[PDB]
């Protein structure tokens, strides 16, 4: 689908990378969802159920959906457009080193924020400073750009 047909979105962290403590991983995802909830009529509620709208997985190579990851670097993660089942789910390549991005590795917060963008129905931006730009660039500045917010309001008001 082009967008979620309900406003109360649920998510399930199905498994964890060992790269970061679980509480830090939980918080990275929470922060990434908080970014989008501030600018939408959507809420994001964590659940412990396979029935969740957005199922989150860490995996490597072929991990069960026919879109295999590729080892270190290259593809970092991917997420499916809104809908039932696999749709809306977000997967992270655990052959990457997940971090806070300041040091070595990729920021789990930034990559998750980007992927949740896709999971709400956004496509890519042509603005380098936008979160939904298709190349990863680590920044400590505010991730959202006018274009990101325009795109998400275009779908959700
Ligand atoms: C096709 C398309 O939509 N455009 C790009 C083109 O890249 C450009 C314009 O430079 C580029 O086209 C060219 C040649 O200029 C092309 C280059 O090829 C590769 C593989 O490097 O890449 C296209 N983009 C796609 S779709 N590539 C894959 C994407 N990733 C995923 C994603 O966008 O979520 C995707 C599988 C769903 S990614 O894993 O590589 C990725 C995952 C996450 C950030 C990310 C980003 C920001 C913040 C945090 C994170 C990035 C990238
Ligand atoms: Ca990879
Ligand atoms: Ca789903
Ligand atoms: Ca890893
Ligand atoms: Zn996948
Ligand atoms: Zn993307």
Helix or strand run (H / E) with residue 151: helix 146-156
The CA-to-CA distance between both ends of the chain, in Å, stands at: 17
Residue 34 has φ and ψ, to the nearest 5°, of -60, -30
Nearest to 51 by CA among 88, 81, 78, 22: 88
Kindly provide the b/e burial profile for residues 128-145, where b requires at least 16 CB atoms within 10 angstroms of the residue's own CB. Answer: ebbbbbeeeeeeeeebbb
DSSP single-letter state for residue 29? H
In whole angstroms, give the CA distance from residue 126 to residue 53: 28
In whole angstroms, give the CA distance from residue 128 to residue 134: 8
Task: Give the side-chain half-sphere CA count within 13 A for 57.
Answer: 19
Burial of 28 (0-12, 13-18, 19+ CB in 10 A): buried
Q: Is 16 in the pocket of ligand 1 (CB under 6 A)?
A: no
Resolution (A): 1.6
Instruction: Count the neighbouring beta carbons within 10 Å of the beta carbon of residue 104.
Output: 7
Q: Is 91 in the pocket of ligand 1 (CB under 6 A)?
A: no
List the domains of the chain with CATH numbers.
1-157 (3.40.390.10)
Protein residue whose Cα sits closest to atom 33 of ligand 1: 134
3-class secondary-structure state, position 81:
coil
Number of H helices, E strands in the chain: 3, 7
3-class secondary-structure state, position 109:
helix
CA distances to 60, 92, 119, 122, 154 from 4, in Å: 28, 21, 9, 11, 13
């Amino acid at each position: 689908d082009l967008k979620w047909h309900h406003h109360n979105i649920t998510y399930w962290i199905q498994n964890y990378s060992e790269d970061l403590p679980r509480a830090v991983i939980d918080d990275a995802f929470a922060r990434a969802f908080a970014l989008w909830s501030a600018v939408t009529p959507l809420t994001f509620t964590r659940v412990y159920s396979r029935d969740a709208d957005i199922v989150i997985q860490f995996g490597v190579a072929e991990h069960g959906d026919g879109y295999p990851f590729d080892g270190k670097d290259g593809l970092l993660a991917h997420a499916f457009p809104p809908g039932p089942g696999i749709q809306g789910d977000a997967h992270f390549d655990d052959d990457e080193l997940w971090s806070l991005g300041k040091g070595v590795g990729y920021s789990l917060f930034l990559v998750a924020a980007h992927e949740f963008g896709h999971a709400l129905g956004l496509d890519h931006s042509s603005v380098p400073e936008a979160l939904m730009y298709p190349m990863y660039r680590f920044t400590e500045g505010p991730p959202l750009h006018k274009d990101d917010v325009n795109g998400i309001r275009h779908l959700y008001g």
